[PDB]
């Protein structure tokens, strides 16, 4: 890393499961915030940062194996962050390590890239790691499958759903288990507010269940 600094956040007290958590395009694990609470001594919630350096991959896999030095792991990506957390999985099984489920919330298998999405000073500082994500997850294409479970958790308000989409579902990048679930709220809401504790409900009877 830059100068020595951390890409995660623990967010609530460690027990049951570590949860490892990518966020959603805003870039800070500070978004998983909601999700610890709801989960608080139930599992440990690890909100990770987009790295903004190109060995971002390595970083979260080197991370995420200090914390928690003994497989197997569950992750978590929201949004975006779905996105995201699948290359870290296919980068840890890629080395052997053993993920053995893997909870998307809200996020579709992105299989072609598009075109890329205070004092000025401070502004063009603070913006850097959205603008980055946002530029990192249109050339990003995620391909194949993981030997990870799925855990593919929606939207319970889905309000202009271009088909598209529903065959983006996740149920071809399965080896081995695949499951879906409805959530609750729309897609912006989901872990914060009023459905953090419908949708975390969820993510732990998928923990509980494992």
Not at 26 to 47: E, R, T, W
Not at 136 to 146: C, P, S, V
Request: glycine share 8%; net charge negative.
């Amino acid at each position: 890393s830059a100068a020595g600094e951390q890409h995660v956040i623990q967010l609530n007290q460690q027990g049951g499961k570590n949860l490892f958590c990518f966020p959603p395009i805003s870039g800070f694990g500070i978004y998983f915030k909601d999700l610890a609470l709801q989960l608080n001594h139930k599992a440990a919630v690890y909100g990770f940062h987009f790295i903004e350096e190109d060995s971002r991959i390595e970083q979260y896999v080197s991370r995420i194996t200090e914390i928690q030095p003994e497989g197997p792991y569950v992750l978590l990506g929201y949004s975006a962050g779905g996105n995201l957390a699948f290359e870290v999985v296919q980068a840890m099984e890629q080395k052997g390590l053993e993920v053995s489920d893997f909870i998307i919330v809200d996020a579709y298998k992105k299989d072609q890239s598009i075109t890329a999405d205070l004092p000025e000073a401070v502004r063009e500082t603070v913006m850097q790691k959205k603008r980055c994500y946002q530029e990192y997850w249109a050339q990003l294409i995620n391909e194949g499958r993981i030997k990870s479970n799925i855990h593919f958790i929606e939207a319970g308000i889905q309000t202009e759903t271009s088909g598209a989409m529903v065959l983006q579902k996740w149920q071809d990048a399965a080896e081995e288990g695949y499951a879906e679930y409805t959530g609750y709220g729309a897609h912006k809401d989901m872990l914060e507010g009023e459905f953090a504790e419908k949708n975390a409900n969820i993510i732990l009877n998928i923990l509980d269940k494992i």
